[PDB]
Design a protein around this nucleic acid. Structure first.
Ligand SMILES: [K+]
Ligand SMILES: [K+]
Ligand SMILES: [Mg+2]
Ligand SMILES: [Mg+2]
Ligand SMILES: [Mg+2]
Ligand SMILES: [Mg+2]
Ligand SMILES: [Mg+2]
Ligand SMILES: [Mg+2]
Ligand SMILES: [Mg+2]
Ligand SMILES: [Mg+2]
Ligand SMILES: [Mg+2]
Lengths: 291, 168, 136, 158, 59
RNA sequence: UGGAGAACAGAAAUCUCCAGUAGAACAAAAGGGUAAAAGCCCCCUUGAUUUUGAUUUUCAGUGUGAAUACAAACCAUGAAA
RNA sequence: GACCUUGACCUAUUCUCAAACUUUAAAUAUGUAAGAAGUCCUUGUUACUUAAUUGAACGUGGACAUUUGAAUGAAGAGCUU
RNA sequence: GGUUGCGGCCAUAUCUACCAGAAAGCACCGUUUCCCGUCCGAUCAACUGUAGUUAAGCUGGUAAGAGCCUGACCGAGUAGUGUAGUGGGUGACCAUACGCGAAACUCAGGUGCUGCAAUCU
């Protein structure tokens, strides 16, 4: 930007998280409310959020106190499974989706019962329930404020979670491969995207036309000696490793909570009492008293 | 001082308010189409007037928004007609500016008698980096006071880069 | 009340404020089928203790003002009383209170009325508006 | 002519509170109602579906049925010289758990403890509440509190 | 291949009534007024196309 | 709605930025309700469907009208809840 | 443009009002509760519900009884034609 | 303690003006082959974390700041009001008795608290 006292007085603030521009409450209501004759059965959202630089997948349920994380999985983990690059791309989104699925089913003790798709040919299928045995763990995709488009990464993480054995109800018409005219999916194209085909094809095409740019982008691929054709083998080897040991393993933590806090305390400004506040006014009138 | 607060063109908007709705409006559309190299957009009347001879929803005026390099080009072509001389009046309090041309031939188009002649409004929107903050979906903020574009600031920039005068 | 005060003391010797505005519309019918009346005139609703008229003057001119208000009473129905205020003019301050606030710089003229320094709000804008305070 | 529609005379009753318009907060939807629960009915004017008739505003009853979006409540309405049972289907946004009951249960619990504690300790305990009693005797000293004499004040004008 | 895009309305107003800015009393009277040759071509209704449309008086 | 800008263009045409708690709109009275909507624009549609019961208002606790929440189907939409 | 002056507009003040205005907001009147049809423990049934050996509803068996869960009253209480 | 994701309550959290911000995060920021969307790669989509930057966003602090919140035997036991009299008064209205009891005002204080998960000199 002035605002009159009357304007200020009558103003109704949005909810904090609507002010912060993070939560869509209209969506949230429809996601979280359970059927009232299911009592304290929690609904579980697969929350998927892209920062720049990171993918966050969390399985969350609600409570009046606040939401409660069942499991989580970040793309910055994926180095542990041998993906060091493109950690916010479509292929990583799939991998993080696969990781959260495999990690959750291990925690619920349901991972032998529901393997998933181990093959991965880019085929539309939900996890079918086992006859005479527990139903699959059901979660709903919560994409937050992200826009729904055909080929967006957020349905990549969905595909990964479905393929990992979570029941995640979905349709096929927002995967890369959906032909809008004939209204069918092309499994080949979806399959390519799962193994970073779109990235590989681009490295091939560009390490050819504009070799100047291929060094600027893809500097990290050159530096580690990764040709375009190896990408499919990275992501294949990554999936296998994810499925073998999905269990979460935290960072070691140089320094402790109290140590971290001590360091940060030193950069936080503190409030000025009420006596200090008074003294500063007394000093300010004394300045304008002379002149 | 910081490179992240260096002005640029957000966008240039070319506007032709034809009064009529019929033939002359479709001719003006052709002019912007060849100039911009983009399919332009037609605006409809907000309400009937009578003296102007326009009706609610009539479909007068056309415009087109250009960004990036072709904004810089089309702006030059436009400032050649003005002889690199804008008035101080032409700069808005929010630090955008605009001028107008009679006759679109002066830009550099072969005449063609079927189309005819058209004036234009050039309107140039300035911003710094980080203007995405106001425009994006999630965590939509406002630009801090220090980072706002100003009349003072835009004028200095226009003089310095283009080597132009600002009158009165 | 005006006429009398202007004759015996002169038109600039007092300020007279009428403190009641007739906002209530009276109806008049003019058989009892369809009897809701039409607007007839206007009237002011006054309570017990409610000020009808106020006059400020110099203290010299008490007797005149009291007489002019006494003359006005005959135009109204009911009982009215004529009261000498403890306050300074049309302000809400007892005469000593106002004087102390004026000896300090805490009062400034605002046409016919007055603005008071509050010990509240921005310190900068107070010092614009009340220079003579603070200076001490 | 006269007018007696379903929401006649609700102008103020179904208004939102000042500065409390807009979306219903989520805790309203995470509350769990069970048959037998005692609830208080208070219409949210922002939710036009499942809305109680104005008569039930401020009435308390018992949940008898639970469905997807809603609860069935029983209310006793006086009609003539007798109470009829009414059964209402309310969306949960117009209902809240009565704290009357919540604070009765805390007493049932507290009484159980006291009664157990009393048997094992081996004595006898009073579990009924009593009305507030007449004050017992007390000595009030005048140390630093000598009585201060007041008198009625004369009339002044202001 | 011709094509026609129209700007979508964001306004709520759907009465064909001009705003309260549109007030003839608010017109500024102290205007330049193009005089001379300037005014000649700018003044519409000052040509043969205008005259040739008007019907002739019977005097 | 207001402000500041842009050939003809003016109080009113169209374009742009800033401010804007709703001061707008929501067929039709008035009241209530609504802001990533319940408003505006766009996409897809026929839940304005089938089968009968229960319930609220008016009340005799009859009818009619209107409305509420479920059930059993079959559908629409949406990545989904 | 230069000023002297009257409406308009803005800012800070000022006098006075509302059945069909309102941030606030009584008194009186008004719904519900104050227990054995309760409470706690234990573990049966189901085609409902759960990712589930989860719940939901109804049960078995067990435990707690006059200070059994405020006051005052109760001329009997309830039911029918 | 900081930061992020998802939150609860929904201004003690908002608003205006200034100043500060290690680390990490977040962000702005680079690119247009691919899916995708636009009058316009601005928004939306994808790709790279590579070229750059704390300028803005964000977080905190400042203000005899505006707003908001809390309290007060502050105003005020005032206004109003339940009950009572073969009380007063021509009336309008008023006083008293046994009860209940505001709002404005004034002054004082305050200015987000907190849950789950991950991360950080
Ligand atoms: K009289
Ligand atoms: K009926
Ligand atoms: Mg949505
Ligand atoms: Mg009526
Ligand atoms: Mg309806
Ligand atoms: Mg009936
Ligand atoms: Mg009817
Ligand atoms: Mg009543
Ligand atoms: Mg870009
Ligand atoms: Mg800074
Ligand atoms: Mg009597």
């Amino acid at each position: 930007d002035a605002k009159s006292s009357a304007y200020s007085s009558r103003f109704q603030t949005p909810f904090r998280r609507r002010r912060e521009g993070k939560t869509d409450y209209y969506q949230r209501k429809r996601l979280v409310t359970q059927h009232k004759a299911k009592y304290n059965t929690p609904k579980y959202r697969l929350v998927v959020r892209f920062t720049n630089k990171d993918i966050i997948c969390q399985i969350i349920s609600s409570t009046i106190t606040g939401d409660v994380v069942l499991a989580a999985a970040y793309s910055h983990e994926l180095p542990r499974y041998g993906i060091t690059h493109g950690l916010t791309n479509w292929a990583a989104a799939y991998a993080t989706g696969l990781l959260i699925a495999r990690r959750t089913l291990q925690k619920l003790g349901l991972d032998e019962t529901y393997k998933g798709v181990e093959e991965v040919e880019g085929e539309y299928e939900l996890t079918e329930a086992v006859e005479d045995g527990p139903r699959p763990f059901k979660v709903f995709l919560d994409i937050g404020l992200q826009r729904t488009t055909t080929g967006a990464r957020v349905f990549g993480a969905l595909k990964g979670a479905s393929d990992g054995g979570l029941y995640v109800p979905h349709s096929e018409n927002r995967f890369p491969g959906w032909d809008f005219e004939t209204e069918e999916i092309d499994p080949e194209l979806l399959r390519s995207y799962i193994f970073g085909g779109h990235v590989s094809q681009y490295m091939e095409e560009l390490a050819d036309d504009d070799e100047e740019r291929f060094s600027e982008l893809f500097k990290g691929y050159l530096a580690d000696d990764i040709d375009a054709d190896s990408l499919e083998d990275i992501y294949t080897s990554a999936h296998e490793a994810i499925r073998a040991d999905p269990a979460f393993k935290p960072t070691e933590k140089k320094f402790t909570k109290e140590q971290y806090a001590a360091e940060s305390k030193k950069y936080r400004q503190t409030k000025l009492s009420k006596e200090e506040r008074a003294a500063r006014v007394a000093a300010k009138i004394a300045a304008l008293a002379g002149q | 001082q910081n490179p992240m607060r260096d002005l640029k063109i957000e966008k240039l908007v070319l506007n032709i308010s034809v009064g009529e709705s019929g033939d002359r409006l479709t001719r003006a559309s052709k002019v912007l189409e060849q100039l911009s190299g983009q399919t332009p957009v037609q605006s409809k009347a907000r309400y009937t007037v009578r003296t102007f001879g326009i009706r609610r929803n009539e479909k007068i005026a056309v415009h087109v928004t250009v960004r990036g390099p072709k904004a810089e080009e089309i702006l030059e072509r436009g400032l050649k007609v003005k002889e690199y001389q804008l008035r101080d009046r032409n700069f808005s309090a929010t630090g955008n500016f605009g001028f107008g041309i009679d006759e679109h031939i002066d830009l550099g188009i072969k005449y063609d008698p079927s189309i005819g002649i058209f004036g234009m409004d050039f309107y140039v929107v300035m911003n710094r980096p980080g203007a995405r903050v106001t425009r994006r979906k999630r965590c939509k903020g406002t630009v801090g006071n220090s980072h706002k574009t100003t009349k003072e600031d835009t004028v200095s920039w226009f003089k310095q880069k283009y080597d132009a005068d600002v009158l009165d | 009340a005006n006429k009398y005060m202007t004759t015996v003391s002169g038109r600039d010797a007092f300020h007279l404020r009428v403190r009641v505005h007739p906002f209530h519309v009276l109806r008049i019918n003019k058989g009892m089928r369809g009897a809701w009346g039409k607007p007839h005139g206007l009237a002011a609703r006054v309570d017990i203790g409610q000020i009808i008229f106020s006059v400020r003057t110099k203290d010299s001119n008490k007797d005149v003002v009291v007489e002019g208000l006494r003359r006005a009473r005959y135009k109204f129905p009911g009982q009215q009383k004529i009261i000498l205020s403890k306050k300074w003019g049309f302000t809400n301050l007892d005469r000593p209170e106002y004087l102390k606030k004026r000896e300090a710089g805490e009062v400034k003229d605002d046409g016919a009325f007055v603005k008071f320094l509050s010990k509240k709000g921005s310190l900068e804008n107070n010092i614009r508006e009340f220079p003579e305070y603070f200076a001490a | 002519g006269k007018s007696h529609g379903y929401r006649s005379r609700t102008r103020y009753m179904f208004q939102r509170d000042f500065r409390k318009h807009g979306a219903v907060h989520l805790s309203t939807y995470l509350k769990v109602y069970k048959v037998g629960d005692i609830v208080d009915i208070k219409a949210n004017g922002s939710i036009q579906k499942g809305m109680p008739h104005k008569f039930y505003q401020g009435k308390t009853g018992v949940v008898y049925n639970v469905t997807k979006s809603s609860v069935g409540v029983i209310i006793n309405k006086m009609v003539g010289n007798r109470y009829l049972e009414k059964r209402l289907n309310l969306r949960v946004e117009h209902i809240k758990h009565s704290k009357c009951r919540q604070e009765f249960l805390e007493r049932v619990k507290a009484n159980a403890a006291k009664r157990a504690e009393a048997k094992a300790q081996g004595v006898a305990v009073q579990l009924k509440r009593q009305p507030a009693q007449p004050r017992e005797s007390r000595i009030v000293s005048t140390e630093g509190n000598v009585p201060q004499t007041l008198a009625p004040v004369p009339y002044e004008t202001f | 291949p011709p094509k026609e895009i129209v700007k979508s309305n964001t306004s709520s107003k759907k009465a064909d009534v001009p705003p309260p800015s549109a007030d003839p009393s608010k017109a500024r009277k102290n205007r330049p007024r193009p005089s001379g040759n300037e005014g000649a071509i700018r003044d519409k209704t000052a040509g043969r196309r205008n005259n040739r449309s008007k019907d002739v008086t019977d005097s």
